[model samples]
Target: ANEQVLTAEQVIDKARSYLSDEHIAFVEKAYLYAEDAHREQYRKSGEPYIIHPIQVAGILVDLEMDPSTIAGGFLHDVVEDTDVTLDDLKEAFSEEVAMLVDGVTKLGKIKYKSQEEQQAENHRKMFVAMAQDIRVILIKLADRLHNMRTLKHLPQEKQRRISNETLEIFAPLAHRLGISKIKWELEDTALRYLNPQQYYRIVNLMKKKRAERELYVDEVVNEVKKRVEEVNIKADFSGRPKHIYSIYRKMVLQNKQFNEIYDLLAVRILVNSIKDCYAVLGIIHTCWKPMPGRFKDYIAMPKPNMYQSLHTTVIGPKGDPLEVQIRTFEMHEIAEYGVAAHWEGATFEKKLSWFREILEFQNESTDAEEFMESLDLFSDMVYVFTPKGDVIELPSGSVPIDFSYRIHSEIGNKTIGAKVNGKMVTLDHKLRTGDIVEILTSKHSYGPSQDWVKLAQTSQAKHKIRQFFKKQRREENVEKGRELVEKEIKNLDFELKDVLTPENIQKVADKFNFSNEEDMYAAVGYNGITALQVAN
Candidate 1:
C-alpha cells in the first residue's frame, strides 16, 4: 500500500538521467503515441492503461538500454491492443523499435489448443524473435516484471497461472540473461502470488529478526572495514538480505526450520580490482576461521551467465556460519544486471551465443512438450569446465553424456567413459560446477548405445542419442538387405545387375509393401522376408 504508482512524467524524468536529449525526444514521442492509443482503456487496478507501459519503459531506462529499445518498451502493446499496424508503428518509429514490438506481439496469442501447447508455441515464437534480436526479450522481460509487480489486481485463478508462468518461464529467462535484478523480483513476487502462506511466513520471520540481524551485520562490517583500511585496500561493503523465495527454498530443500538457517544474510564486499578481491578474502579468512569446503572461487571460473565472485562461509564472532561475497566493482555490476551491464559494445548474437544453442534445441524438439522440457535447462544450471578452460552449462543432474553432446555429437557418440576432475568415472556421472570433465572417446568404440538415451539428461543430448540409434538401425538394415539380395541373386544364377535394376527393385519393394528398395533389402537382411521370396 505504501508503493505509489509511477506516472509517465516520472518515467520520462528517470529516462533523462541516463538518456540523451535526442533519445529523450524519441521516447517522449513513443509515450505520447502509446498514451493516446490506450487513453480509453483502464487496468483492473483502475489506473489508465498507459501507466503500465510507462513503468515498463522506466525499467528499460534503469537498465540503461539504447534509445530504440526504450521507445520500443513504450510502444510494445499498441500494435497488439489498438488499431495500430506494424506498418504504422514502423513509419512512426524506426524499423528496430517497430520490429521489437512486432516480435512481442507475435507471442501474444489466444489458446487454439491445450494450455501446454499454447504456452510452448508462444515460448517458441518468443525464442525465434530472441534469436534475431536480443532487445525483444529484454523488453518482454521488463514488461513481465511490471506485470508481475501489479499482478494482485487480477482474479485468483488468473493470478496463480500468471505467477506460475512468471516463476517457471520468465524468472529463469531473466536468470539465463544474467538479469538478476529482474529475476529475483520476479521470483519473489510470483512466490507471493502463488504461495502467499509460505511467502508471508518467511517475510514475517525475517522482519522479526531485522534489528538484531542489522546489528550483527554492522559488527561484521566494522570489523572487516578496520582490517581492510589497515591493509590500505579500497572497498565498499554491505550486509544483504536473502530474497523471500530463496529463504523458503533453503527451508524446504534442506528440511530445516527457519531459525536453523544462519546464512540468510550475506556480507557483500565490492573492491576496486581483482587484486583487492583476493586481499579482502585473505583478511576475512584471517579474522574468522573459514568453513571447510564452503569456499567457491567463481572469480577463477565464472558462471555460464558471466557471473564472477568469491564466496566464503566463515564462523562469525557469535559462532553462526556467516556468508561473505567478494568481487570487483565491474563484477558487482555484472552480478546485478548480468548480461545487460555489458550488452553494449558487443553484437547481440555474439554476446548471446547460448541463445543460438537454444534455437538449435527448438529445431531438434519438434514436439512442443519436448521443447518446454528443454526450456528447464535455462533454470537449475550447472557450470562445468573442460580441461582446456572452456565452460559448458548444463542443467543440474546432467551427466557426462550431456556434456559430451554439448561439446559435439561426435564426442557423444564415441564416448566410452569420462574423467571428472582427473579421475575416471562412469559415463552417467553427474557433472558439478568447477569439475574439469575430460571425455574419453575412441574410433574403435561403437556408436552411442540405446541405453545412452536413458542416461542423458538434456533434451539436446537425449535427442541426439536417439537420432544416432535411429540412423544406425536404418543403415544396418539397408546393408543387410542388400547383402541378402545379392546372395539370392547369385544362387539363382543371375548377375546382381541383371534382376536388381532400379525399376525391378522398385517393383519388388512395392510387392512387399515396402516404401523403397533399401527397406525391402532391410526386410530381407533382418529376416522379415526370406532370400528365396525376394528372388522369386
Candidate 2:
C-alpha cells in the first residue's frame, strides 16, 4: 500500500519507540519550523497546510528514514511556496536538510514552451539533485504520493493528467528504487483513477474468485510450511495478494483474459538465513514438479537493486499454477522497502552503485531529456555483464549498442560489432541477464550510422549518436549533400549555393514527405532516388 498514515504526534510517538532523543529533538524542531513556515496556509480542500507535511514526514518515519531525511520531508515545499530559502534552511537545520529541501523544490516559476518541456525540466532537476544524495527522490516521492491521495479535490481532467503521469514515471521510478510495495501501490492507485470502470471490474472479478483462489493458495502455503518446518527451519509463510493493476496488466498489456491468468494465486516464504533459503527450495521442488523454465534464482544473482529471492512457479495438487518466492527475512525487507533498507544496517554502498553510474553522465545531463534517457528504463530491468563480470544495467530488450555507450561514449563511437555470450553477434543483438558482453570497437570506424538511433534502447545512446553527427557531420552532410545537388544541376550552370539553399531543400524534403533534407540526400545516395529528382 501507499505508506501507512499516522497522526503527527502518533508518528513522533512511533519515532520515539526507536529513535534516539537527539533525533527526536531534531524532528520536533523541524515540526515546529515547518508549522511556522506554513502558518495560515490552506490546501485546496480547506485543510491546514501543516497536515500535508505532517503526513509526508509520517511516511518517512514509517520508512524509518534518518532524522534529517524526515526533517527534510517537512521542509520540502517551503522553498517553492513560502518565503523560506535554501540558505534559511541551512542556517536553521544543517546543510544536509537544506540540500534536501533545495532538491525537492520544483522549477515552478520557470517557463517552458510546452508541458512536455516543463516535465523534462522538472525531472532534470530531480536527477541532478539525486547525484548528491538519494534521499531527495524518496522525499519527493512521498510528497507526490501525499498529493496523489488528495486528487479528488481536483478536476477530472487534471486528475487523469496527474494519474497518467504518475503511472508512467513515478511508479516506475519507485520500482527502480526496489520498493515494489510502493511501486505497485502507486500504479494501482493511478489505474483506479485513470480507468475507474476497468479497475473496479478487476476488483470485482478478484472478489468473485477469492474463495477458490485462497483455497488453492492455502494448500500451497500449508504444505510448504509443513515441509519446511519438518526440516527444523523456522519459516514464515504469507500469501501475497496480486494488486488490480498487476492483474489488469496481463489483460491490458499482455492481452490475457481473466480466466487465462490463473497463476495469480501466490505465496511468499521467508526463512532465517541464506542457507535455509536453499534448503527450503529443495523441499518445495521435491514436492511439486516446477514448470520447467519457470524457475528463477535471484538469490545467486540479485536484481539491480539488490533484491534477492528464489522464484519458481509450480502446479499444485489440483493442477493450478502457484508462484512461490523463497527468501531470507532480510531479503524480504529490502524487497519491500528497497533503498530504505540501508538504514537497517544493510550495505548501501554495493547496492547504490547504479546511482553513481547515472551521475557519471552528468556532463550531458543539463536537461531532463538527457538525464532521464541516461537512466535505465525500469519495470523489468536487466543487468548484463562485461566479460570481466563488471555489471551494466539497462532496460530489458536493450541491445549491445545500448550496452556499449551505456558504458562509455568512445566505446560506442568506435564500435563495429558485439559478442554477447561469447559469440559474435550483430550490434543490435538484445542483451539478457548473465550474458557476458564484449563490444568490438575499432578506431578506423568512420562514424555511427543513423540507423543506430532506432537500434539503441536507452536515450543516452540515441543522443550520443546525434551528438556525434551534430559535432562531426554538420559540415560534412551539408557540403556533401550540397555537392550532389550541385553536380546534378551544373548542366544548367546553376550554383547549389542558390538552388540547394535551405528554403529550396526544405521544399524538396516536404514534397518527398521526408522529415529533413538529410533523408532526401540519403535517398539520393542509396535508395535509388536520383540527384536529378532533387535538381528539379
Candidate 3:
C-alpha cells in the first residue's frame, strides 16, 4: 500500500481534531496572514514560500502546541525575509503574536571584525533571546528543520555551516529541552551534510540489508504482540528503521561496522498502563533468552529527559540479537516527543517543570563567558541516581562535590565526605551510573572551601562555592579595606580616622554606586575597588 501523502490543508485539519475552536481560528488567521506576506516569495525549489510556514505550522500542530505557538510558527519568517514590520504584525495579530515573531528575528546587521566573532556574537544574541522566552527556541528549531529539509538547494559550504551549527548548538539545545525526537532528527539530518561519505555508507548499508532487517524486526514485533495478546493485554507495537546518521554515530563511537550494530531496526512496544509495561517485559524475557547485562529498567528509573522504558537485548529465532523497548503509551509518547509531550495535560506540566530548574541552573552564573563555558560541561552528561531512587544527571567525570552542589548549596557547603555505591569515597571521587551516593554533611563545618571552585565541573557548584567564600571572608575583607583606606589617607598627609570619616566614605560610596559605606569598605578591603582610584 502506498503511504498517504498529507497536504497542508489535511495537516491543518488533523491539527484541528486535537485543538479547540479558539485555537483553530487563531491558526487560520496566522495562515492567512503568512500566506499574504509571503505571496511573492519562492523557495529554491520553486515552491511558494508560504508552503514552508504551512509545513512548520503542521509540525507544531502535531506537537500539540497552543494556538498562539502554531500561529507564531506560520509568521516566524515574515518579519525576517519580507517587508512585514513588527508594528504591522502587532496591528494585525495580538501583541503576543507580534512579540513571538520579533523574538524569532535575528539581530539585524551586526558589525563584527571577523567571521568567527560574528558567529560567536550571533550565538550570544540567540542565547539572550532564548533566555527571555523558551518559545523562541521552539520556533527556531522548526525553522531550522525546514531549512535542513531543503539543504540540497544550498552550496556545499553553506550546507556545512548550517549543518554544523545545528549539530553543535541547536540539536543539543533540543536535547536539553527534552525534545529528543526533534533532537535526533536534527542530528541525523546534520550528519548527512557534515559527513556525506559516512552518511551515504550507512544509507547504502541499510538499503542492502533492508529486507533482512525488516524481517527480523517484524518477527520480533509479532512475537511480542502475540505474547501480550495471550496475556489479554491491549498493546501497540511497531518497529522503525534507525536513521542513517544515528547508525553512523553508533558505528563511529563504538568502532563497529554495519553488521556489528544490533539495534539497526529496534522494535518499540507500548502498552496501556505501567503494570502492563512490566508484564510485557516479562513475556518477552520468557519467550527469548535475554542477553546478559543487556536489560535496562528505565521504567523504575527514567532518564533525565523523562524517558521511561524497559529495554532488553535478546536473541531472536534466527539467532540474531535484537533490541526491544517496552513502555506505557505515555512513556512512548515522551520517548518520541521528549519535553513537548509534557504540554499535553496536567501530567506534562509536572514533567516539564524541571526545565525551569535547569534554566535557573544556567542563570546563576554572573558572567556571560562563564555561562557559555558551563554550557559545554553539560554537553556530555551521564544520568546517575541517589539512594532514594531520585535521578540526577551530571557532566561526564563529575565528582561528588558537583553532585552535592546540584542537590543544594547548603548541602554542598556542609558536605564533609561522600559514599558511592555504599563505599566511603572522597569529595573528589568520580561518579559512575548506578552509584547510589550518600553525602556526609557537618553543621559545624566552616563552609565550602575555595579550593572546591577548581574541582567542580558545573558552573552552578563553582559559582556557589565562590559565593560561600565571599561571604566567609567578610571580616578579612573589612580589615583589608581599612588598611587600604588608611594607607591612602597617610599618603595624602591626613589623619586616618579623620580623613576616612563616615561623610568621606559616603562620598566615595555614592561615586561607585555602592549602597553605603560598609559596601564600599568591603569592596576596597576585598581588593575589588581600587585604592589608586581613591588616591587620585
Candidate 4:
C-alpha cells in the first residue's frame, strides 16, 4: 500500500539520459515555475501539487519526447489550476509551451447548457487541440498516467468516474496512438477500480501460477535463444507478461478458465532488422510446429497504429499453445512508444491518417453528442483491403458502405452494390480482417438510399448519407415554401406582390432568426415556422 514518492531530481536525471543540455535547462526552468505557481496547492492525496507535474515530466522523459514536450508537461496544469494565466505562461515559457498548456486546460469554468453538453464540448476541444498539436496529447497522456497511478487517493465515486473516462476514452486513445505500454497500464489500473471483484480474482489466479509460468517462460526463452544463436540470428528474448485487464478480457470473451488460456504462455524476441525478424520466425517454426491459422505477418501489413510485428502460435515444451512475437529493434521501439518514437523521424503530419479521419467527422457532426459518438472509431479498428490491394481501416462491424465512403464520399453517394472477396454482398455485410472489398458506382444511380444513414455504421458514412438527403431536401423545401407563402398572402386578402416584397420577406426572416428569406421559407415548409407565423 506504500510507494516511494518520486523526486524532481530523479526525473531530471532520467531526462539527462536522452535530452539535450539546452532543453534540459528549459525543463528545469518550467519545473521551478510550476512549483512556484502551485506553491500552496496539494492533491487529493495530500501531496504537493508540484509532484503531479514532476511525475508527468518523468513519464514524458521515459517516452523520449523532445525538450519542449517535456517542458510543456511540467507547465501543462499551471494555467488551469493555479493563479497563472495563459499570458503568464507565454511570458515564462515559449509560445510552443504555452500552446501545449492551453490545449489541456479544462473548459469547465464557463457555464454550458448541461453537464453532458459541457463534457461533449470538452471532448471536442481536446480533439481539435490534438489535431493542432500532437505534443499536447502526449503531455495530456503523461498527466493522466500519473493521475491514474494515484487514483487510490480519490473517493469511490470520483475513482469510478475517472476510471470510466480512462477506460472509455484515454485508454483507447493510447491504443490509437500505438502506445501499448500506456494502454495496458491504463486498462489494468482502471479495471482495478471499475471491477474490483473480477480484477482481484484474475490477479489472485495469476499469482497462484506466477512461479510456474516464470520457469516455463525461462525454459522456452533459453531453448529458442540457443537454436537462434546456432543459426547465427542475433536477438534478445524474454517472456511477455500479459496485463491483468487483458487476461480478464480474454477470459470473459472466450469464457475459458485461467488454466485453459494457452496463449498466456508468451515470449517476445527482438532482433536487429526485418530480415532477422523473418529469419528468427523461420528458426522458431523449424523447431516447433506452428498452430494452424495462428501466424500473422504484421510486419508486411502494419496495423493502423503503425505497429509491426511477426506473431505466431506454436506447441511448446508442455504441448501447449505458446504465442511468440518477433520484431526488429526499430519496430520494438514503435511497438512500445507508438507514434511517440516517430516524433523526429517521420513526416509527422502524414503518419496520422486516422487523426485526419477524426477531423473530418468532427467537422461533420453538428453537436457534441454526435462528435463524441464518432469516437467509437478509436476503440476498435478493422483493416480490410481495396480491390487494388490497399488497406482501408474502419471501425469494427463496419459494412461495405463505410468502406465505400472511406474510399470516396462520391463513391459512397453513387454506390449501387459492393463485392466482398469476389462475391456480391449487401452494403450491410460486416467486414472482417483481410477481406477484399470492391465498390460499384454508377453515374445513373439515384444518389444514396435514405436508409443508408441507418444502415451505415461509421460516422463518415452516416454523416455523408445524411448530408445527401439534407441537400436534396433543401431544393424541395424551397419550392414548397414559396407556394405556401403565396397562398397565405392570398388567404389574408393581401396583394401577392405587396406582401411578398423583398423588405417584408427580409423582416420576417430576421424575426425568425434566419439569415435570409430562403431559409425562413424553408423553415415554414418544414413546419418549423407555420405559414401564419411567417405572414403575421
Q: Which candidate number maximizes TM-score? A: 1
Compose the digit string of candidate 3's lDDT tens values, residues 156-232: 99999889878855776676556777887889889988898888877787897788778777777777777668667
- Over the stretch 40-93, how does candidate 4's per-residue lDDT look in tens digits? 788756877887888888888889887888888888888868888999988876
RMSD of 3: 20.9
Candidate 1 lDDT tens digits, 3-95: 666778887888898768988898898888988987887775787888788888888888988778888889888986888888999898777
C-alpha lDDT of all candidate models, in order: 0.76, 0.74, 0.71, 0.76
Candidate 2 error regions (>4 Å): 1-5, 107-125, 344-354, 358-536
Tell me the TM-score of each prediction against the true structure: 0.64, 0.63, 0.60, 0.63
* Model 1: per-residue Cα lDDT at residue 149: 79
Worst 10 residues of 1 by lDDT: 368-377
Per-residue lDDT of candidate 2, residues 1-536 (tens digit)? 44455677898998898789999999999999998997887776787788889988988887988888899898888876788888898999898787777767642233343565356445645555444446777887888788788777888999998898788557766766677777887888898789999999999988987888788888777877776677677986789888888888778865578874756758888888765666666677668867877778776566665578988787776856777888988898888998776545765555446564443343234223211322333446666656543556788788888898988999889988888768989987787764578898888889689799988889899989999987665556556566765555555665645655567656755686875666665444443335555545
Indicate whether candidate 1 or candidate 3 has the larger lDDT: 1
Off by over 4 Å in 4: 107-125, 129-131, 344-536
Q: Which ten residues in a row have the lowest lDDT in candidate 4?
A: 368-377
Q: Residue 183 in candidate 4 has what lDDT?
A: 91
| Candidate 1 C-alpha error for residue 391, in Å | 26
Give the TM-score (vs. native) of candidate 4: 0.63
